[PDB]
Amino acid sequence: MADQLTEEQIAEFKEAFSLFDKDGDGTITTKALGTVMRSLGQNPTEAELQDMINEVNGTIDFPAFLTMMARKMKDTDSEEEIREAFRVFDKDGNGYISAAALRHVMTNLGEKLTDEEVDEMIREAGQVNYEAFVQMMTA
Amino acid sequence: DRVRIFRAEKSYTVQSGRWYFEFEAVTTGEMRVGWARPELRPDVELGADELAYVFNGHRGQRWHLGSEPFGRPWQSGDVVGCMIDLTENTIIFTLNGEVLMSDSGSETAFREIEIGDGFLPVCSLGPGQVGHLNLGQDVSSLRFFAICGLQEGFEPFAINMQRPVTTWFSKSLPQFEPVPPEHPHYEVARMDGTVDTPPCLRLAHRTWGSQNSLVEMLFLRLSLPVQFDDPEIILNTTTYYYSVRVFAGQEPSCVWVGWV
Amino acid sequence: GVTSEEELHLTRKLFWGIFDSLAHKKYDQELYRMAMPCL
Amino acid sequence: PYDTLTAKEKARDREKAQELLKFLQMNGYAVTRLDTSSIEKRFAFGFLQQLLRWMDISQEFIAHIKFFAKILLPLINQYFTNHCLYFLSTPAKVLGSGGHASNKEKEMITSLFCKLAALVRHRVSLFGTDAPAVALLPVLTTLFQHIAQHQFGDDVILDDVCSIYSLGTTKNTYVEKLRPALGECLARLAAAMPVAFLEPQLNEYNACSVYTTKSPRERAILGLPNSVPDIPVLDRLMADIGARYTEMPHVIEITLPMLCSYLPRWWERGPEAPPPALPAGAPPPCTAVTSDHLNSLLGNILRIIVNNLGIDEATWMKRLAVFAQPIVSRARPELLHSHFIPTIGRLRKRAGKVVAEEEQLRLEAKAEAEEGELLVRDEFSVLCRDLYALYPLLIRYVDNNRAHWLTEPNANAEELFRMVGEIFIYWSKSHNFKREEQNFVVQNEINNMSVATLKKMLPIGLNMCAPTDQDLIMLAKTRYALKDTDEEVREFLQNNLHLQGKVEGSPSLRWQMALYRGLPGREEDADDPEKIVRRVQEVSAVLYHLEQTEHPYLLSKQRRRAVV
Amino acid sequence: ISHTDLVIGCLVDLATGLMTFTANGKESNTFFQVEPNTKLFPAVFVLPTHQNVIQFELGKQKNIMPLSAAMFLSERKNPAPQCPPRLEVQM
């Protein structure tokens, strides 16, 4: 989807794309997209920009650019969201969490999950760090 | 020629209870002491596979599917017994009435044993040495026991019999026996009864890696005691013929044919 | 061995493949396995 | 490169090469330009080039580059190979290995109480320390070099009556000294540095305020395995001329320290001010039982521990001997030739104290068992303090174990009675850890920073000796008592019920297979005075012990994601 | 390296105890004579060097019967060769 990006960075991408608009129609070629994409900070290799045209002729528009930028940021966002969301679960934030504490805090995340589900979840596995929880839930 | 192992006859094969025996040694050679399954194949050093669970006190080794360091070497006397409990499937050894710890310290590390077809006391002897078994047929002669035994639930292997345990051993003297049709690398079969070729027996082999072979001194099964074509000559003749054919790829330099 | 003193980068392959150097305990007492030659 | 060629090109091209020289030797055309050279030594030689450098290129500028990276790659690799082999010291012995230990020791000097960067080299030295601890020794004098900084280190105590030389330089020092054990070269001027350290440390415990560390105080005991000035007249100062049976060694305190300890034991000595020096040097008084065979003065070895036990019988306080209990390791060696056949009072000293401890624990357990008036304020009183007695209990039990690992033969043989008192009073955990005392079970810190760990594990060693004096014929009722205790019938409330159980029945199998030996090994008595009690002893005892060994011994591919 | 099969046949005369051996139909120089009341089992000793090694044939020559009609009293008058299941090899 394209709903994982906030409005301000969408605005930044729109400004970056419009600043080098060809004739106002948003039609740009393969050489210039690398320049505009390296203009705002991200400077990767040539392979990904070779495969971008493969996923979608020499006619590149703003929607395709936004979709590919969105789904190359979304993988990093998803890979990183599994570490920050655990920060609240442990008091110090390092990763150590008592098994007794979760008995009354892990049943109130808003998912309407009662005691039985967490019984089966924690029984199927002391203090457990974050990576063991990653293996525990991601599977 | 190398070892002379000893065992009990396989109708004392035991499948439930708690049993014991002790061993007595004079010298300090190479002794194998332990339990064994009834299908003890000779010509094989015991403890090299799953057939027998054995302990060697010469170098502090226990053998099952290979050696393992366990216990200290011997001294003179060497009064050693064998614990056994099929309820929890555990085997323990005791030296001079003292259990031997494991590498990190445990109960002989021999655990999770299947009942199968029961077990037998077994004992071997290296050259020149002497052993003295005691299956416990009289309790005064059993020397230490007491400290181990009574106050944990045990009694010895032969505790209540009016006649002593018969025993077996490996002879060494080779004897002929029919070839078992499960011999890794040896295959024999009957060929045919065709008009041209007469009935004949052939052999085979697995000529490759893995293993090899030596000289198979084979011999057929029967006899020919001595005696004490025209239809005339063939019904009065006393002289008969057999034949072998060495095939190609076999050197007649390493072939001997005749009578035994 | 090669460049044991060149790339002073702390995050280089030297600090990464440092365990690859220990991967040589396979050779027993082969201290006298061969002579001494190079290029 | 050619060194990495296949077996096909290393057998035929060499033949194409070996025979050419053989053709050269034809007609007299000779052109010349399995000795254990050891690649390991060549690696050491490759290390020698780095060792010959090292301080030659770094300390020439450090004490006054990309080259400062090889040390962070080779030093880490040396911690493995040295610990991987650990068997090179058996066959092809070479002193070249011992050279690198000293060649690096000089490089490890510079600031043998400070330095910089990494301190793992000290740990790397500890790894090479195991490798060491005819020619043997030669150009080194490391021991002589060890006497250098260690000399003024004795004045360091007077310089506060040197800060990591008692740590780093004392690490491998206390290590290699205690790692010796097996081999033993000699003692050339070692006692000179020792007496300059021993007598210096023998009175270094008088300086208050800064008492420094007691770690190196155990290093004197660690080095107590060399040979034979407090009183070294013909051994120290008056011995610069040039070692037979000089009947004089630790005889300066043979009966003196014995009388001193006896007087120290006679006194209460229930304070940190007590022992002090002895608390940091009398642990080396047990190392004297080495060269003296087992113990020629057997009574001395049968009292030194007893007097030491009296110090333990004095009983500490809250914290008190919190760190002053790590000397129990040496105590597990004084029981070697423990000919304590006497015991009796010493046995009672281990019994009555434990019984007093059992009474003290009962005074704490019942103070927690009979206190359920809804108040968490007792958690500081009932609990917490339980850990104080717990850590105290985990001190005497580590001594009685080895004591029972020798007093079991004659004890279980002949008769009993003696150890019967210990077995009857061994219901400590039975009246605690097995008595559902969660607090006593809450070792926690005692379980962590001080499963299966003593407490009841010690009872297993004498459990057989406990049932040894039990039924010498008909048991049976014990099984009925086991079922009775399983129904939770208090304690004495079951004995009265056990008193009404007809009689002991046995007249079939077994019996003559078992009680026949008991009818020849017992020879004591037979009456109705026993009844339960002796039968009610191991009944409820092994009952809870059995319970301790009984039972005691979803989400689709989608919902999953969401939870994250 | 011979690409042909050396066939060795033996000849045992029961009423005389005389034993001779033929090599591909060409008689060898050796011979053997034994005591009156003795027995003999046919024998081949070999160290094998092939996938297929030997092949004990049970045949007759031009005017002499096979071993088959010599060991069984009932078959002692039937010249036709036989291979009853009792004939087995031993190792």
Coordinates of C-alpha atoms in Angstrom, one line a residue, chain A residues 45-112:
Chain A
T45 CA 23.9 1.7 -6.7
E46 CA 22.7 1.2 -10.2
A47 CA 21.0 -2.2 -9.9
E48 CA 17.8 -1.0 -8.1
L49 CA 17.3 1.7 -10.7
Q50 CA 17.8 -0.9 -13.4
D51 CA 15.0 -3.1 -11.9
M52 CA 12.6 -0.2 -11.3
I53 CA 11.9 0.2 -15.0
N54 CA 11.6 -3.6 -15.1
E55 CA 8.8 -3.6 -12.5
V56 CA 6.9 -0.9 -14.4
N57 CA 9.3 2.3 -21.8
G58 CA 11.2 5.5 -21.1
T59 CA 8.0 7.2 -19.8
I60 CA 8.1 7.6 -16.0
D61 CA 5.3 9.5 -14.1
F62 CA 4.9 10.7 -10.6
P63 CA 2.6 7.8 -9.4
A64 CA 5.1 5.1 -10.4
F65 CA 7.9 7.1 -8.7
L66 CA 5.9 7.5 -5.5
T67 CA 4.9 3.8 -5.5
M68 CA 8.5 2.6 -5.9
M69 CA 9.8 5.1 -3.3
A70 CA 7.0 4.0 -1.0
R71 CA 7.7 0.3 -1.2
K72 CA 11.5 0.8 -0.8
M73 CA 10.9 2.8 2.4
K74 CA 8.2 0.5 3.7
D75 CA 10.5 -2.5 3.9
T76 CA 12.9 -0.6 6.1
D77 CA 10.0 0.8 8.2
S78 CA 8.6 -2.7 8.7
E79 CA 12.0 -4.2 9.6
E80 CA 12.6 -1.4 12.1
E81 CA 9.1 -1.2 13.7
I82 CA 9.8 -4.5 15.5
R83 CA 12.4 -3.0 17.8
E84 CA 10.8 0.3 18.8
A85 CA 7.4 -1.1 19.5
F86 CA 9.0 -3.4 22.2
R87 CA 10.5 -0.4 24.1
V88 CA 7.4 0.1 26.1
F89 CA 7.2 -3.6 27.1
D90 CA 10.4 -3.4 29.2
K91 CA 11.0 -0.6 31.7
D92 CA 14.7 0.0 30.9
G93 CA 14.3 -0.6 27.2
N94 CA 17.3 -2.9 26.9
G95 CA 15.3 -6.1 26.4
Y96 CA 15.1 -7.8 29.8
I97 CA 11.5 -8.4 31.0
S98 CA 10.2 -10.4 34.0
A99 CA 7.8 -13.1 33.1
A100 CA 5.5 -12.3 36.0
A101 CA 5.0 -8.6 34.9
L102 CA 3.5 -9.5 31.6
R103 CA 0.7 -11.4 33.3
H104 CA -1.2 -8.2 33.9
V105 CA 0.1 -5.8 31.2
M106 CA 0.2 -8.0 28.1
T107 CA -3.6 -8.6 28.4
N108 CA -4.5 -4.9 27.8
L109 CA -3.0 -3.9 24.4
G110 CA -6.4 -3.1 23.0
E111 CA -6.6 -6.3 21.0
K112 CA -9.2 -7.7 23.5

